[PDB]
Design a protein around this ligand. Structure first.
Ligand SMILES: [Zn+2]
Ligand SMILES: [Zn+2]
Ligand SMILES: [Zn+2]
Ligand SMILES: [Zn+2]
Lengths: 80, 149, 82, 140
């Protein structure tokens, strides 16, 4: 049968919603741009999941993740 | 906006606790203030531990900056566990509530840590600073807290 | 079927564009596109080159692991052994 | 193996889900032939063409050689008399992220590109260029 484990692993760990404009930090962990920039106020802080240090100087868009989240929104778009 | 996104997260976390609670825990729904800032979790001590048979209650208080700041969490009610990291008034000594807090932690993860802390404990003792700490906590005028901000 | 196809949708989204297999040790270059460590370095003979997907210049020293992507491919490997 | 693994996944993709207007004929994974029919709304509707795909050992990091073959060759400003295809994606816009499927789609996009069914300005010149060559005989 079907499973929604799909959705759990495209969920940002900060806002708990599907990633919007996901970015990676140095360690390679991904977050919504807005959520991790909330975390890194002042130009830096530590990773929510691994606590390795990061700076938003080196934000990198996660293009694979952006494309996948978008495509899955389409499949999940349903009439109510 | 901040609080809209904070409300969204908190709503999803409350659904998870009602639908798949951690072992020995239950959320108290007779406390229905539209669950947007404080909720009470009934928790029972685990078998084979120092708290077998005991019924406790946990209070979760969420500030305006949750989840980037940690919630306030304490035992309340009149049965408060006797434990080296819990004060007589129910305050809890746990740094994931302090400087090991990260926004990626959840109510679920805090609940598991409290449970892990109860059943890890091998000595039913109160915290060494308890009488000092509670005497100072009974002299502070925080009575009406607007506190959510 | 009962959105069994959505299963395959996620499989293709975790497919590396170079080998056309699920990402193995996925890494990101500067533009933020993702590849198997070993495919992207098959490309970047010499220390750097151009992104297969978008043509942005990359250097192999700037590789970064895609922890989210590695994390999700095994959750799907787990699921399909039914 | 990773190259043959890719080529078999691509070859199955063609046999089970060919691009619109395409079908393949005659199991040799170094070389395969795809039948192509003109689409409604283009100047090549109804005509039957054939594409040859040649894969080298460095595929997909070097581009396959792709050409029209047979005795029906389309008349098109980016397609020569001999079947060679003038498409930068076959040359230095090649990337390993491109596919047979994506190359097929680009050609279809090209058949429907042109407003006048014309031969390339280099056509008689360019194919006379290629008729003198030592040729890729036995090993390359
Ligand atoms: Zn987020
Ligand atoms: Zn991290
Ligand atoms: Zn690969
Ligand atoms: Zn790129």
């Amino acid at each position: 049968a079907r499973l929604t484990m799909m959705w759990e692993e495209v969920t940002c760990p900060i806002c708990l919603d599907p990633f919007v404009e996901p970015v990676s930090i140095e360690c390679g962990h991904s977050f919504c741009q807005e959520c991790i920039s909330q975390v890194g106020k002042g130009g830096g802080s530590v990773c929510p999941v691994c606590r390795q240090r990061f700076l938003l100087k080196n934000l990198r868009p996660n293009r694979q993740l952006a494309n996948m989240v978008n495509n899955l929104k389409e499949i999940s778009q349903e009439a109510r | 906006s901040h609080m809209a996104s904070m409300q969204k997260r908190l709503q999803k976390e409350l659904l998870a606790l009602q639908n798949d609670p951690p072992p020995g825990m239950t959320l108290n729904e007779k406390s229905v203030q539209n669950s947007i800032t404080q909720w009470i979790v009934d928790m029972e001590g685990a078998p084979g531990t120092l708290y077998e048979g005991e019924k406790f209650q946990l209070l979760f208080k969420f500030s305006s900056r949750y989840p980037f700041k940690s919630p306030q969490v304490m035992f309340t009610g009149e049965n408060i566990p006797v434990h080296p990291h819990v004060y007589s008034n129910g305050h809890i000594k746990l740094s994931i509530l302090t400087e090991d807090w990260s926004p990626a932690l959840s109510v679920q993860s805090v609940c598991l840590s409290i449970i892990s802390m109860l059943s890890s404990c091998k000595e039913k003792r109160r915290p060494p600073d308890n009488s000092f700490y509670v005497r100072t906590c009974n002299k502070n005028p925080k009575k009406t807290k607007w506190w959510y901000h």
